[PDB]
Every structure is written in structure tokens, then in C-alpha cells.
Design an enzyme around this catalytic site. Structure first.
Site, PDB file in Angstrom:
ATOM      1  N   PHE A 157     -13.832  13.246   8.666  1.00 23.70           N
ATOM      2  CA  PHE A 157     -11.922  13.751   8.830  1.00 23.70           C
ATOM      3  C   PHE A 157     -11.237  13.142  10.103  1.00 23.70           C
ATOM      4  O   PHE A 157     -10.148  12.684   9.984  1.00 23.70           O
ATOM      5  CB  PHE A 157     -11.885  15.004   8.806  1.00 23.70           C
ATOM      6  CG  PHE A 157      -9.824  15.128   7.869  1.00 23.70           C
ATOM      7  CD1 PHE A 157      -9.071  14.153   7.495  1.00 23.70           C
ATOM      8  CD2 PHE A 157      -9.704  16.403   7.874  1.00 23.70           C
ATOM      9  CE1 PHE A 157      -7.749  14.885   7.159  1.00 23.70           C
ATOM     10  CE2 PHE A 157      -8.726  16.801   8.011  1.00 23.70           C
ATOM     11  CZ  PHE A 157      -7.010  15.671   7.456  1.00 23.70           C
ATOM     12  N   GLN A 160     -15.293  17.138   8.281  1.00 23.82           N
ATOM     13  CA  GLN A 160     -13.981  17.491   8.914  1.00 23.82           C
ATOM     14  C   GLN A 160     -14.512  16.163  10.311  1.00 23.82           C
ATOM     15  O   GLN A 160     -13.986  15.299  11.276  1.00 23.82           O
ATOM     16  CB  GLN A 160     -14.847  18.302   9.652  1.00 23.82           C
ATOM     17  CG  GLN A 160     -14.505  20.121   8.699  1.00 23.82           C
ATOM     18  CD  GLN A 160     -13.076  19.316   8.452  1.00 23.82           C
ATOM     19  OE1 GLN A 160     -12.006  18.842   8.705  1.00 23.82           O
ATOM     20  NE2 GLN A 160     -13.259  20.146   7.062  1.00 23.82           N
ATOM     21  N   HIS A 190       0.175  27.996   4.471  1.00 22.92           N
ATOM     22  CA  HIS A 190       0.231  25.901   5.338  1.00 22.92           C
ATOM     23  C   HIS A 190       1.830  25.996   5.551  1.00 22.92           C
ATOM     24  O   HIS A 190       1.544  24.917   6.288  1.00 22.92           O
ATOM     25  CB  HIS A 190      -0.063  25.575   4.128  1.00 22.92           C
ATOM     26  CG  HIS A 190       0.059  24.178   4.343  1.00 22.92           C
ATOM     27  ND1 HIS A 190      -0.675  23.819   5.191  1.00 22.92           N
ATOM     28  CD2 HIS A 190       0.512  22.823   3.643  1.00 22.92           C
ATOM     29  CE1 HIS A 190      -0.459  21.998   5.116  1.00 22.92           C
ATOM     30  NE2 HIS A 190       0.052  22.091   4.381  1.00 22.92           N
ATOM     31  N   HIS A 203      -3.064  26.094   0.062  1.00 23.33           N
ATOM     32  CA  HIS A 203      -1.269  25.164  -0.045  1.00 23.33           C
ATOM     33  C   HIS A 203      -0.529  26.312  -0.578  1.00 23.33           C
ATOM     34  O   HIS A 203       0.184  26.585  -1.309  1.00 23.33           O
ATOM     35  CB  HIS A 203      -1.315  23.810  -0.875  1.00 23.33           C
ATOM     36  CG  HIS A 203      -1.674  22.627  -0.597  1.00 23.33           C
ATOM     37  ND1 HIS A 203      -3.171  21.789  -0.546  1.00 23.33           N
ATOM     38  CD2 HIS A 203      -1.325  21.452   0.143  1.00 23.33           C
ATOM     39  CE1 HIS A 203      -3.238  21.227   0.079  1.00 23.33           C
ATOM     40  NE2 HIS A 203      -2.500  21.053   0.679  1.00 23.33           N
ATOM     41  N   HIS A 243       7.494  21.091   2.187  1.00 22.99           N
ATOM     42  CA  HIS A 243       7.090  20.350   1.602  1.00 22.99           C
ATOM     43  C   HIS A 243       5.947  20.113   1.059  1.00 22.99           C
ATOM     44  O   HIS A 243       5.241  19.284   0.221  1.00 22.99           O
ATOM     45  CB  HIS A 243       6.393  19.543   3.176  1.00 22.99           C
ATOM     46  CG  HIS A 243       4.991  19.766   3.567  1.00 22.99           C
ATOM     47  ND1 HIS A 243       4.865  21.131   4.009  1.00 22.99           N
ATOM     48  CD2 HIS A 243       3.682  19.795   2.999  1.00 22.99           C
ATOM     49  CE1 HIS A 243       3.281  21.790   4.621  1.00 22.99           C
ATOM     50  NE2 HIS A 243       2.562  20.702   4.243  1.00 22.99           N
ATOM     51  N   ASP A 244       5.394  21.954   0.585  1.00 23.92           N
ATOM     52  CA  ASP A 244       4.432  21.674  -0.368  1.00 23.92           C
ATOM     53  C   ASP A 244       4.160  22.801  -1.351  1.00 23.92           C
ATOM     54  O   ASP A 244       3.641  23.734  -1.762  1.00 23.92           O
ATOM     55  CB  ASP A 244       2.993  22.324   0.514  1.00 23.92           C
ATOM     56  CG  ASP A 244       2.163  20.839   0.453  1.00 23.92           C
ATOM     57  OD1 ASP A 244       1.815  20.584   0.163  1.00 23.92           O
ATOM     58  OD2 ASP A 244       1.360  20.977   1.503  1.00 23.92           O
ATOM     59  N   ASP A 249       2.152  17.862   9.129  1.00 32.28           N
ATOM     60  CA  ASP A 249       0.542  18.254   7.796  1.00 32.28           C
ATOM     61  C   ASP A 249      -0.704  18.641   8.402  1.00 32.28           C
ATOM     62  O   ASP A 249      -1.865  19.067   8.029  1.00 32.28           O
ATOM     63  CB  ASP A 249       1.521  18.017   6.651  1.00 32.28           C
ATOM     64  CG  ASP A 249       0.220  18.190   5.460  1.00 32.28           C
ATOM     65  OD1 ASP A 249       0.319  19.115   5.754  1.00 32.28           O
ATOM     66  OD2 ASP A 249       1.139  17.018   4.705  1.00 32.28           O
TER      67      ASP A 249
HETATM   68  C1  ROL Z   1     -10.011  21.247   7.421  1.00 35.41           C
HETATM   69  O1  ROL Z   1      -9.439  20.792   6.908  1.00 35.41           O
HETATM   70  C2  ROL Z   1      -8.926  19.502   6.356  1.00 35.41           C
HETATM   71  C3  ROL Z   1      -7.528  20.083   6.863  1.00 35.41           C
HETATM   72  C4  ROL Z   1      -6.786  19.135   5.656  1.00 35.41           C
HETATM   73  C5  ROL Z   1      -6.988  18.956   5.001  1.00 35.41           C
HETATM   74  C6  ROL Z   1      -5.029  17.707   4.611  1.00 35.41           C
HETATM   75  C7  ROL Z   1      -4.969  18.357   2.791  1.00 35.41           C
HETATM   76  N1  ROL Z   1      -5.977  18.195   1.680  1.00 35.41           N
HETATM   77  C8  ROL Z   1      -6.045  16.185   2.530  1.00 35.41           C
HETATM   78  O2  ROL Z   1      -6.367  16.166   1.413  1.00 35.41           O
HETATM   79  C9  ROL Z   1      -5.748  16.350   3.666  1.00 35.41           C
HETATM   80  C10 ROL Z   1      -7.687  18.058   4.780  1.00 35.41           C
HETATM   81  C11 ROL Z   1      -9.104  18.935   5.347  1.00 35.41           C
HETATM   82  O3  ROL Z   1     -10.303  17.989   5.300  1.00 35.41           O
HETATM   83  C12 ROL Z   1     -10.699  17.454   5.021  1.00 35.41           C
HETATM   84  C13 ROL Z   1     -12.220  16.539   4.923  1.00 35.41           C
HETATM   85  C14 ROL Z   1     -13.076  17.572   4.116  1.00 35.41           C
HETATM   86  C15 ROL Z   1     -12.559  18.247   3.118  1.00 35.41           C
HETATM   87  C16 ROL Z   1     -10.912  17.658   3.199  1.00 35.41           C
HETATM   88 MG    MG Z   2       2.771  17.085   0.340  1.00 36.79          MG
HETATM   89 ZN    ZN Z   3       0.534  20.201   3.321  1.00 32.64          ZN
END
Ligand code: ROL
Ligand code: MG
Ligand code: ZN
Ligand code: ROL
Ligand code: MG
Ligand code: ZN
Ligand code: ZN
Lengths: 414, 411
Positions: free
Chosen positions: B372, B369, B164, B160, B200-201, B318
Site C-alpha cells: 500500500f 501496508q 475517519h 468509515h 467526503h465519507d 484521505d
Molecule cells: C491503514 O491502512 C489503510 C488505511 C486506509 C485505506 C484506504 C481506505 N480504503 C481503501 O481501500 C484505501 C487503506 C488502508 O490499507 C489498505 C492496504 C491494506 C488493506 C487496505
Molecule cells: Mg470516499
Molecule cells: Zn475517506
């Protein structure tokens, strides 16, 4: 999505229902079914159709995650992650006489202010907490309690005409009296009562005597930092809870983490509900609550889950915040002057800011009597009428008193 | 009497007289799929419009009747050459050829900008979309704001950071260029969207809202635990405009600014990961009822529809990392874990129970991943791709391939 598919199912009932006394019954039901069909779709909003859809997706994923968390140590780690992230003296004698009326709706908070060195908030709060034995219940030392109470009362502007500790003290005592409604006996837990009273006491702390609208318009730091949404309500809460951090002032230090967590949830919930723009939403929930009210033997209400109780509690604090027209005319009249004085001070703030004067803010243009009758008829009476229905027969008097005062202000219009 | 109750009052006299299967299925499915606040919004709308009729009438009466109606209505009713300093320069220019391409390497943009990818990419986007001319934004004003913005993105934070922000900004820029969305958005809506993405961040401390709530942080305390970071980002974003020669919005009309502020707040608040299901819900309903003008361009009427798309667009941007090329995606995975790990290092010093993916001994990087993607990223992008079909197919394909790659890496 659910509503889309539910509408498709009932739409099919209509198309396949068509496929002397019988005729009357048949035809009367068809147009009734059709009436309910239109009324389903028409009363539907974006966030109402979406809420049922989001909540199905939430439920569906939580099933899949429960399964995955049973697979490996890893499945559990992934499930826990996803679940947490994407799922939600001479004065002391008179003060004592005035305090006999602590449980009475007709208490004169103005005399309480008079006999308490203009400290009605500390005076009334300590009185409430001793009456409800909350200090013993929640292990709150007097020393800590008064330390908090005094600092709280200190952060209520003295210079502000209506949103001062006197208004806070009124809402606090009014909430205390509403909690004593017979119709709501064993109903609330001691922590729910604690949450409610504390919510009332802090609901307007550090109020600058101007509207959220004014703050947004003047591009105030407060508006800027709370992204123009519930700017004051958020600010009151932030101050209320930050004051606990002061030297020997943590009134909640002797509650369990869960107790504190829950109380913080409810207090935020209730003070945010004191946003006057949330009015219609509160009145909606209260009306649905009356409609589906279940009453246990001898009159006491039956409110099951937290959701129901918090709807009542936030409506209770809101009703207490809008209690002035239901008070005796002697009291009510003084609140009217106080509110106008504050309104006129904001107008003066807009005059030198070169801003177009807010409706009611100019003492030169104000109509007051006609205004109270508007205020009662459109906001205060609908709210109290609903409350009185929920808590029937209690609060019948609160309504008659309001109705009388409306007719009095009506009779004052020149 | 409230509407849903009024409906079921008649629907129940109908069934208790009609006497069937599809009516009795939806008899239960109406009540059961009904929440606590979905029921509430039907009613609060009924009362709001009821009162607005009465006040319209009262306004017509006297000068007084107007003062009272205006009061009640307002109170109880709602609503350099590149921009960065560089000697590398020519390399930066080559990387910037891909500004409108999904495959731009933001990491090289960072390299050839003296680690200023946010200023670099934003100035590039604004020149590409001719927004500086459109909205009378002098270059100094822009670079001035952009630099301060980039400055309030923590360097110490692994994921962040301005890199990003730069990625979401460029990704949003590319999503706005989707053919399926041509005349759809106004220039101010585009301005709102890009600025929303860029901020946004901002001032992200490298921890979750959950962490901040748990640690009883000042930030949590002051924002009453709801969308603690998202509210904070917005507050910083907009306060930075107050810096000397930084007001990029100073040349918009009051209404333009008012509207832009509304949309920007709306979009950044939507980047709360807990608002995920709600965003997806709206996007799915939007897909279901989608109306498409000749030659493929979507037909989004009212603001309500466009903002649903715009907030979903920024949210999708995002969560774009798994839909980027594996070379890029892989780096984002390392970056996210590094920050996650460091989040746990804070929990450790605090004696707090270490968060799920926050420990390197316990972290399932690859299996994670795939979780996710499968549960969050793919459903979102699959929905988006449906709305803007056939566009976004390439994104979905890349996503699908990368999911299979991480699947193949699970030990
Ligand atoms: C490239 O991966 C990620 C890239 C971005 C995010 C977002 C930013 N923070 C979050 O909670 C969502 C999570 C990721 O992976 C998640 C699953 C595995 C750990 C976190
Ligand atoms: Mg945010
Ligand atoms: Zn973000
Ligand atoms: C006793 O009067 C009032 C008492 C309380 C309130 C609340 C405080 N401010 C609000 O907007 C709601 C308004 C009053 O009267 C209104 C009618 C027109 C002027 C304000
Ligand atoms: Mg308030
Ligand atoms: Zn108040
Ligand atoms: Zn300058």
C-alpha cells in the site's frame, strides 16, 4: 510525464534539423514542422496531457503488480487488492399498414400512436424485437417483454408535450432503421443491437418536461441527488434498469452474467451520451472515426475493437435523438410544435417560480422558424453531415430531406 | 478536419520528405502514448470554440438572434464552548492545542467529546480559521448541521465513521496551513475544502463501490455504477443543509454558493480511489511546471490549477494514515482491517467470492501496508512533498519510517 518528454524530443529535432530546388523543399518542410509544433501544444487541454500521463502510470504499476503477484500468496493478495482499487379491429388493420414501414425512415409514429391506443412505444418495440427476432435470440417470453414495455411506457409522462413515449418510440424506430444501414452489416453483435434498441427505448423515461439546467436552478431533488451532472440522463437509466425489477418484467433474466454486465455497461454508456452537453465530444469522436475509417469489400465498414463500435453506437443513438429535422416536413413540423409546447410549459414553471424566463421558453417572445434554422445549421446538419460521411453513400437521402426542411423553415421567417 | 489528424497529416509529409532518430522515436511515441479520449478532447475543444464564435456573432444580429444563440450555447456547450457536550472538557482542550499540528490524536478528541470528534474538530477548525465570522455562520446553525452530519456517519462501521471524517477534516486543515501555499486560496476555497473533507465519507455503509455494483445495490443502480459512494456522500452532505436551522451556507451570495457547490462536488468525486492515477498524473504535471513566488510561496494562477491542488490535497488527506505517528497509524490499520473483514462477512452471507484482504485467515496485514505504501501512499506523498518542498518533509520521513517498521513485522 509522456507529452512533456515527447515535446522535448521533437523540440530537439527542430533545433538539430537546421544544423535551389533543395532550398524550396528545405524551407517548405521547416515551417511545416514548426506549424505542427505550435498545433501540438495549442490544441492541447488539461485532461488531454493528463490522460496520456495517467495511462502511463496505470501501465507501469500493472507491470510491477504482475511481477509481485508471482512472488508469494501474499504478493498476489496485495496485487489483486491494489489492482482492483486504484486501477480502472379497424385500428389493428391501419396499425399493420403503418407498421409495413417499420424498417423505413418515413414511418409515421403519430399514426402508430393513433392505432395503438396511444401506446407507440410498446407497439414499435414489440414490432422491432419480432423483426430482429431478438425475443427468440435472447429467450425473452412475450409475456415478460410486454410487461416490461408497458411499465416502461407508463413511466413516460403523458402530461409532457415532447418527452413522452411518442418521442421514445421515434428514437427507438429511428435507431432500428440506422442499425439496418448497409454500411454496417455483420459489424454489431446481437447484444450490441439489443443494448442500442433498449438504450433508445429508455433514453428519456420519467422525463419531467424541463431541462437539467432548470432542475439545477430550481435546486430539485433530482439535481441534488445527481450532483448537478447529467441529472436527467442518470435518472432515465436508473428508472429503466429499476423497472426490470418489477413482477415478471426482467427481459434480461435469460442472459449470462457477463452478457448482462456488458449490456448494462453499453446501455449506461449510450444513454449518458444523450446529454446534449456531451454533443461536441460525440461529434469529435465521430469525425476522428470518419478520418480513420477502414471499409471492407462491397462497402461494409470495418470497426475492430469495442471502443470503436461504442463510439458509433452512442453517436447513432444521439443522431436518432436529433432525427426530427431529417424526417418528412409533415412529421418534422409536428415535432416542432411539440418541442415548443414543452418549452413554453417550462417558461410557465419559471414565471410563477419568479425565475428569469429561459431562452425560447416564453410563447410571447419565441421566434421558432428562425430557431429551427439555427438548430439545423449549427447542430443537426454538422452531426448528420458527419454521420452521412461515415455511412456513405447511404443516408444521402436523410441529408437532402434535412437540407430541404432547413430552406423551408428559412422561407417561413417573417 | 480534427487537429491530431491534421498534425500527423503534416508531420507525415515532413518525415516522407526530410529523408532522424529522435523524430522516428517520437513518430511512434506520439501515436502510441495517445489513448482514445486524449485524442477526442483536442477535437471537442476545437468545435466548442468554433461554434461559440458563430453564436457570439448571431447574438449581435436581432433580439431573436440572441434568443437562439443563448439557447444553443446553454444546451450544446458545457458549463457549547467547544461545540460538543463535555465534563472531561480540559483534557479535550489540551488535545485541541494540537489542532494545527499533524500529530493531533483524533482518538483522544473522540474520547473527550462523548464520541463526537467530527463536531469537536470542525467547530475548532472553523473558530481557528474564523470562518463562522467570515461567512456569517451562527453557532447554532453550525453545531446543528455538524451534529446531523456526524449522526449520518455509521457507528457500526469500523473505519468509515465520523472518526475517519474528523481525521481527514483536521488533516486537510493542516495541509491548507502549508507555508508553500499562503495567499493561494480564497476563503471560499478553504471553506469548500474543509466542508468537502467533513462530508467526503458521510453515510458510508462499510463496503466498496465494487461490492455495491456486484450486489446490484439500490445505490449502484441509481448511480449507474460510476462513483456510487462518492456521489451518495455528496448527495447526503448537501441534502442535510435542508434540515431545520442547519443551512451553514444560507448567508453566502448565489454565486458564492454556486461556486462552493462546484468545488465541493469536484473534490469529493476526486476521493474515488479509482481516480487515483488521474489525480497523481495532474499533481506530477503541476510539480513539473510549478512557478514559485519570492520566499517560497507557490504561484497557482487559474481556478483549474487550484482545484487540481485542492482535490489532490483532500485525496492526500484521505490517504494520510501511514504518514501519521505509528501509535495513530497502527490503530488505523486495525480499523481498516476490521471493516475489510466485516466486508467479507457480507460477501459470505451472500455466497460471494471473498474479496482479497477481506478474510483474517488469508490477510497479510504487514506485507499489505508495505505494498500500500510502496505502490500508492509513498508515490502520492513524494509528489505532494515535491510541490510544496521543503514542507511535507516531516510527513515523508514519518511515512518512510513506518514503511520500514511494517516491513520489519512481516513473519
Ligand atoms: C491503514 O491502512 C489503510 C488505511 C486506509 C485505506 C484506504 C481506505 N480504503 C481503501 O481501500 C484505501 C487503506 C488502508 O490499507 C489498505 C492496504 C491494506 C488493506 C487496505
Ligand atoms: Mg470516499
Ligand atoms: Zn475517506
Ligand atoms: C423539432 O425541434 C427540436 C427537436 C428536438 C430538440 C431536442 C430536445 N430539446 C433540445 O434541447 C434538443 C430540439 C428541437 O428544437 C430546438 C430549437 C429551439 C427550440 C428547441
Ligand atoms: Mg435524453
Ligand atoms: Zn430524447
Ligand atoms: Zn434551531
Amino acid at each position: 510525464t509522456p507529452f512533456a518528454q515527447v515535446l522535448a524530443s521533437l523540440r530537439s529535432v527542430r533545433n538539430n534539423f537546421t544544423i535551389e530546388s533543395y532550398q524550396k523543399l528545405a524551407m517548405e518542410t521547416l515551417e511545416e514542422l514548426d506549424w505542427a509544433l505550435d498545433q501540438l501544444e495549442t490544441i492541447q487541454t488539461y485532461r488531454s496531457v493528463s490522460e496520456m500521463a495517467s495511462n502511463k502510470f496505470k501501465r507501469m504499476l500493472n507491470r510491477e503488480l504482475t511481477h509481485l503477484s508471482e512472488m508469494s500468496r501474499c504478493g498476489n493478495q496485495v496485487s489483486e487488492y491494489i489492482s482492483n482499487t486504484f486501477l480502472d379491429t379497424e385500428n389493428e388493420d391501419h396499425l399493420a399498414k403503418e407498421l409495413e414501414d417499420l424498417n423505413k425512415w418515413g414511418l409515421n409514429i403519430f399514426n402508430v400512436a393513433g392505432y395503438s391506443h396511444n401506446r407507440p412505444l410498446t407497439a414499435i418495440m414489440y414490432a422491432i424485437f419480432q423483426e430482429r427476432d431478438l425475443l427468440k435470440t435472447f429467450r425473452i417470453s412475450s409475456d415478460t417483454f410486454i410487461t416490461y414495455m408497458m411499465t416502461l411506457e407508463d413511466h413516460y409522462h403523458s402530461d409532457v408535450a415532447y418527452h413522452n413515449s411518442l418521442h421514445a418510440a421515434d428514437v427507438a424506430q429511428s435507431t432500428h432503421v440506422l442499425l439496418s444501414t448497409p454500411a454496417l452489416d455483420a459489424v454489431f453483435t446481437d447484444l450490441e443491437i439489443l443494448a442500442a434498441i433498449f438504450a433508445a427505448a429508455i433514453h428519456d423515461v420519467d422525463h419531467p418536461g424541463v431541462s437539467n439546467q432548470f432542475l439545477i436552478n430550481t435546486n430539485s431533488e433530482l439535481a441534488l441527488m445527481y450532483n448537478d451532472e447529467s441529472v436527467l440522463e442518470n435518472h432515465h437509466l436508473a428508472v429503466g434498469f429499476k423497472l426490470l425489477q418489477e413482477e415478471h418484467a426482467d427481459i434480461f433474466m435469460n442472459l449470462t452474467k457477463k452478457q448482462r454486465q456488458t449490456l448494462r455497461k453499453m446501455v449506461i454508456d449510450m444513454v449518458l451520451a444523450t446529454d446534449m452537453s456531451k454533443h461536441m465530444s460525440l461529434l469529435a469522436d465521430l469525425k476522428t472515426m470518419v478520418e480513420t475509417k477502414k471499409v471492407t469489400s462491397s462497402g461494409v465498414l470495418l470497426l475492430d475493437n469495442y471502443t470503436d463500435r461504442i463510439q458509433v453506437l452512442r453517436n447513432m443513438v444521439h443522431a436518432a435523438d436529433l432525427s426530427n429535422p431529417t424526417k418528412s416536413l409533415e412529421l418534422y413540423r409536428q415535432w416542432t410544435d411539440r418541442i415548443m409546447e414543452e418549452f413554453f410549459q417550462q417558461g410557465d414553471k419559471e414565471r410563477e417560480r419568479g425565475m428569469e424566463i429561459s431562452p425560447m421558453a416564453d410563447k410571447h417572445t419565441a421566434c421558432v422558424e428562425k430557431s429551427q434554422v439555427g438548430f439545423i445549421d449549427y447542430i443537426v446538419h454538422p452531426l448528420w453531415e458527419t454521420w452521412a460521411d461515415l455511412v456513405q453513400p447511404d443516408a444521402q437521402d436523410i441529408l437532402d430531406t434535412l437540407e430541404d426542411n432547413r430552406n423551408w423553415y428559412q422561407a417561413m421567417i417573417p
